[PDB]
From Swiss-Prot, chain B:
Acetylated on several lysine residues in the presence of glucose. Co-administration of salinamide and rifampicin or salinamide and myxopyronin suppresses the emergence of resistance to both antibiotics. DNA-dependent RNA polymerase (RNAP) catalyzes the transcription of DNA into RNA using the four ribonucleoside triphosphates as substrates. The RNAP catalytic core consists of 2 alpha, 1 beta, 1 beta' and 1 omega subunit. When a sigma factor is associated with the core the holoenzyme is formed, which can initiate transcription. The rRNA transcription and antitermination complex (rrnTAC) consists of RNAP, NusA, NusB, NusE (rpsJ), NusG, SubB, ribosomal protein S4, DNA and precursor rRNA; S4 is more flexible than other subunits. Belongs to the RNA polymerase beta' chain family. This is DNA-directed RNA polymerase subunit beta'. It comes from the Bacteria. Transmembrane segments: none annotated. The chain holds residues 396 to 444 of 1407 of the full protein. Signal peptide: none annotated. Disulfide bonds: none annotated.
Swiss-Prot record, chain C:
This is DNA-directed RNA polymerase subunit beta. It comes from the Bacteria. DNA-dependent RNA polymerase catalyzes the transcription of DNA into RNA using the four ribonucleoside triphosphates as substrates. The gene is rpoB. The RNAP catalytic core consists of 2 alpha, 1 beta, 1 beta' and 1 omega subunit. When a sigma factor is associated with the core the holoenzyme is formed, which can initiate transcription. Belongs to the RNA polymerase beta chain family. Coiled coil: none annotated. The chain holds residues 697 to 796 of 1342 of the full protein.
Curated annotation (Swiss-Prot), chain E:
Belongs to the RNA polymerase subunit omega family. One of its GO terms (cellular component) is DNA-directed RNA polymerase complex. The RNAP catalytic core consists of 2 alpha, 1 beta, 1 beta' and 1 omega subunit. When a sigma factor is associated with the core the holoenzyme is formed, which can initiate transcription. It comes from Escherichia coli O157:H7. Transmembrane segments: none annotated. GO terms for molecular function: DNA binding; DNA-directed RNA polymerase activity. Keywords: DNA-directed RNA polymerase, Nucleotidyltransferase, Transcription, Transferase. Promotes RNA polymerase assembly. Latches the N- and C-terminal regions of the beta' subunit thereby facilitating its interaction with the beta and alpha subunits. Its EC number is 2.7.7.6. This is DNA-directed RNA polymerase subunit omega.
Curated annotation (Swiss-Prot), chain G:
The gene is rpoA. It catalyses: RNA(n) + a ribonucleoside 5'-triphosphate = RNA(n+1) + diphosphate. The lineage of its organism: Bacteria, Pseudomonadati, Pseudomonadota, Gammaproteobacteria, Enterobacterales. This is DNA-directed RNA polymerase subunit alpha. GO terms for cellular component: cytoplasm; cytosol; cytosolic DNA-directed RNA polymerase complex; membrane; transcription elongation factor complex. One of its GO terms (biological process) is cellular response to cell envelope stress. Changing residue 161 to K: 5-fold decrease in CRP-class II promoter-dependent transcription. The chain holds residues 5 to 236 of 329 of the full protein. The N-terminal domain is essential for RNAP assembly and basal transcription, whereas the C-terminal domain is involved in interaction with transcriptional regulators (such as CRP) and with upstream promoter elements.
Amino acid sequence: EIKELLKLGDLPTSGQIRLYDGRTGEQFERPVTVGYMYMLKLNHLVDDKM
Amino acid sequence: AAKKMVEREEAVVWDILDEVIREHPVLLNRAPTLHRLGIQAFEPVLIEG
Amino acid sequence: KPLVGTGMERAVAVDSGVTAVAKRGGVVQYVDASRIVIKVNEDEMYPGEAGIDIYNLTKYTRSNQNTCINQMPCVSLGEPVERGDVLADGPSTDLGELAL
Amino acid sequence: TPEEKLLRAIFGEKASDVKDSSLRVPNGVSGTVIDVQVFTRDGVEKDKRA
Amino acid sequence: RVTVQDAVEKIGNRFDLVLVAARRARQMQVGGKDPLVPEENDKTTVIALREIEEGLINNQILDVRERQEQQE
Amino acid sequence: NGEPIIVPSQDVVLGLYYMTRDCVNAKGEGMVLTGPKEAERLYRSGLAS
Amino acid sequence: VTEFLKPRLVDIEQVSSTHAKVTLEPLERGFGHTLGNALRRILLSSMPGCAVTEVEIDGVLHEYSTKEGVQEDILEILLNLKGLAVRVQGKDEVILTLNKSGIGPVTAADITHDGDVEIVKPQHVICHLTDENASISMRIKVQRGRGYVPASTRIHSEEDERPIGRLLVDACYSPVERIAYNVEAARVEQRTDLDKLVIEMETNGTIDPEEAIRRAATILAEQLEAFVDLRD
Amino acid sequence: SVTEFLKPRLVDIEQVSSTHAKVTLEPLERGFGHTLGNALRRILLSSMPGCAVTEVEIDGVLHEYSTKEGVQEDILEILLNLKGLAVRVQGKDEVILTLNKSGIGPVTAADITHDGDVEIVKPQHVICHLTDENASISMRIKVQRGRGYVPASTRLLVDACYSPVERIAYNVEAARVEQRTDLDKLVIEMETNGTIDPEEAIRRAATILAEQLEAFVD
């Protein structure tokens, strides 16, 4: 049901697209998983631990 | 005057500190010091953050 | 909001008291950044009452963990609400859904 | 001490006779003051900010 | 200086190296000396290891030089 | 035990394993190169895998 | 072998007011990716812009207040105003003024213009007035810059001084927001291996695409002119 | 200001040998070290004009692979030793040279005929060893001025290393002006074959991109 929902977009149904390097512009080969993880910000800051 | 200058952290005390920091190790140690490689000395390179 | 949620996110947001949940239905008489005035409908108005109830929002107050607790009213002017429905999201809530 | 009896006789500025236990922002934190609350004992009158 | 490998093999002991380089750095810092090897904007304890590296500071060379400083 | 403790741990070994593990039909098969300089010049220009 | 051909712009395709597809046809083999990626790094890195830097509001002390009769805090207003796209012409910093009364959404079109200061997106909603007797008064200090100064480093100590009611906004002076470049083979008559370069930039509106390409190429060429006669 | 950026105050060129340099550029704008050194590496690798051999015949010994007795080193290793030959050629775009040698000694790159425009930057570069008084070799090499790396499979044909730099690789470090340490520091390192010097190799390639930026700058 993810791949079917991915096919409702025009995104590749394996999950992985082909990413190009930011600095040098040549691609990473063997394509890379991208997507949207819900990343948190935990209550361990470096402003309170330094 | 040195105390008020480096409390102000003027544009010269970074030059004096990077002079001070050059070959002067810092003992970096992490807490469960099970063996002697839990304490090693490193030359410090000034980063921000 | 979490794009990939569990559907529990709305229930935990509402049941934790940090949201401002409409006790009765009605239409917003007035919205403000610190208060929401809900003109209650004739259905549930309890005939010895004055008509509206004022939700006094909690602005930039301090948490136990020294963070900020702040309520943003998500509804607009004249927007009809029901009872139970979220009018102001608490800290870490997007539209009455848990938003961590 | 000596070398203060010579220095405070040069510029003549007295001993301050009060010390400066005041409240300052701790090191590193830069913020915005968003509330000040003054609580007074009843025997003490008030001041202008209270 | 990264490693003291040439210095510890030029003395033969790792701890007496620390003591000898400490004595030389004390002479160079507060004792009043000049660096024997040219210092390439090094701190005082790196000049001491680069003087031990070139055979120019051992315990007996430092001691006979202390004899010569007493000689005047 | 006198084995090195500065063993490359996880990303370094994936890089060193990925670059040094062969493929049967990759681009630039069977060429003859004068040395490693020619090999890095061929790979970095995108002529060889 | 013979020599290198030199490119020039063949198309400035304004797909929208922001989205643009410039085209750069005559390029040598292997200069397509070089020029496209180098120009993407210059464009996404360092273009001049006019993000707002200070916002002052009459009756508001700090960013953590609520103005009476608006349904937003000051922080939501500042974060809306940080995304104010505005092109200023002859100036470098210009203090716009926002006065609005009555019930309504407060847009970017309600700002008193100057003639030499051009908002490109006037429907960018700044705040939401929700009372008839309530009204605001802003002083939106646009300032020309390049890159990204957070407000945490804009206040060095201070310029000279600062009153208790001047809010600072972390200015992202960067007009561009997305650069894609494709290198496709160029249809000319004489040669076959020559390839075109289509940069599909996505600005915020406050920059011309041909002007941005020329500014990036000027930056790259002057760094290369520092690189072109070395010193021993 | 937004008009100025930053510029390399220092450029100190270490010269480990004459065919090897390590160029450094201590102040530079933030993230610009990659967008400069990557551009220079791509130009020095794939579009840098020079000349080297492209094909050879060895007077009818045979085509692929080989069989030749009386040579000590293999053929497809003679092709390799010809591949590492770096020649300077004048406005003649293609030159065909004949290498004939007999004896037991190892034939060097000085055993070519001389025609003035062809210069051999290392005339002691061994092409073959002979070691037999009976056998001998006679080969017609074909130098030609070209663009990048043009292999044989994209074409007794040799791969051609037209580009005069053998290895170019940059690193990027950090530096500081007074308090600003987010800056870059390009530490470009390159080795040419001998066709040009590496200080001339950067200044020719950085020329070539500035010409490629002709119709947008002011």
